[PDB]
């Protein structure tokens, strides 16, 4: 806005898994106001995550996010008759947002049948550094680390 920053909304702790990271995942899965539907998908995929490791699922979730959080994004800027990308530093609570969007997004177009086994397989493949969500992490990094020459115009 013209008049400075807006207050951001607090997320209440998730009752089944006592963490605000789970309730920040259910709002990315949420479509059309189906929040009790969106929580059955997230809870159901996290129960399937411990059925393939035995480990606690939110520890697997935080290992899955740490492999897909970007550190450098590649925002665009025009100067004269040419454009380029400036590598800028991702503030941390944007990197939480931008990584939860990649896990939900790249697993909606994944090859399984239901959304529970699509979301759970993307979490397990990201907590090992294998999935397509991990692939966009280094594609975001290789794009931004190919443009260090333009890191001197940071607004």
């Amino acid at each position: 806005p013209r008049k400075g920053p807006a207050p951001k909304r607090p997320l209440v702790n998730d009752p089944v898994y006592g963490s605000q990271l789970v309730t920040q995942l259910v709002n990315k899965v949420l479509l059309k106001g189906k929040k009790s539907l969106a929580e059955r998908i997230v809870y159901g995929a996290l129960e399937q995550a411990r059925d393939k490791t035995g480990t606690d699922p939110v520890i697997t979730l935080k290992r899955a996010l740490d492999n897909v959080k970007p550190a450098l994004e590649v925002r665009s800027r025009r100067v004269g008759g040419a454009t380029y990308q400036v590598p800028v530093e991702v503030r941390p609570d944007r990197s939480t947002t931008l990584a939860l969007r990649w896990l939900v997004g790249y697993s909606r177009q994944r090859r399984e049948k239901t959304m529970i086994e699509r979301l759970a397989n993307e979490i397990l493949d990201a907590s090992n550094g294998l999935g397509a969500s991990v692939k966009r992490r280094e594609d975001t990094h290789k794009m931004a680390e190919a443009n260090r020459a333009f890191a001197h115009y940071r607004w």
Partner: protein, 117 residues
């Protein structure tokens, strides 16, 4: 296959490019790796990041000839001029005295016409 302990590091820095040559105190070139030598083409050569990659590439190639300390003679109206001096330090050299040797005519030759850009 040489050994020269103290040398001189000449830095030319224009609005288009930067050339970082390292010589002996008699003016014999030891290594010279510039900004287009490291992979850069067009207007990316004049950026300060392209300057500090050239200053590393000439420094660590001069240390293969046993150079441990350089004197710095900079010239030219470029912004890759102080990112090069702070890249010879952070490559294993001791930079010594810094001099500006930019040529200054005493109302000498006629410059080209001004650009109606």
């Amino acid at each position: 296959k040489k050994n020269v302990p103290h040398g001189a590091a000449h830095i030319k820095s224009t609005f288009n490019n930067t050339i970082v040559t390292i010589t002996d105190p008699q003016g014999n070139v030891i290594a010279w790796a510039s900004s287009g030598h490291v992979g850069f083409k067009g207007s990316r050569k004049s950026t300060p990041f392209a300057a500090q990659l050239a200053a590393e590439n000439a420094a660590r190639k001069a240390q293969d000839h046993g150079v441990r300390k350089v004197d710095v003679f900079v010239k030219g109206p470029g912004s890759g001029r102080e990112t090069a001096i702070r890249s010879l330090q952070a490559a294993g050299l001791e930079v010594g005295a810094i001099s500006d040797v930019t040529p200054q005519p005493h109302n000498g030759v006629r410059p080209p016409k001004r650009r109606r850009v």
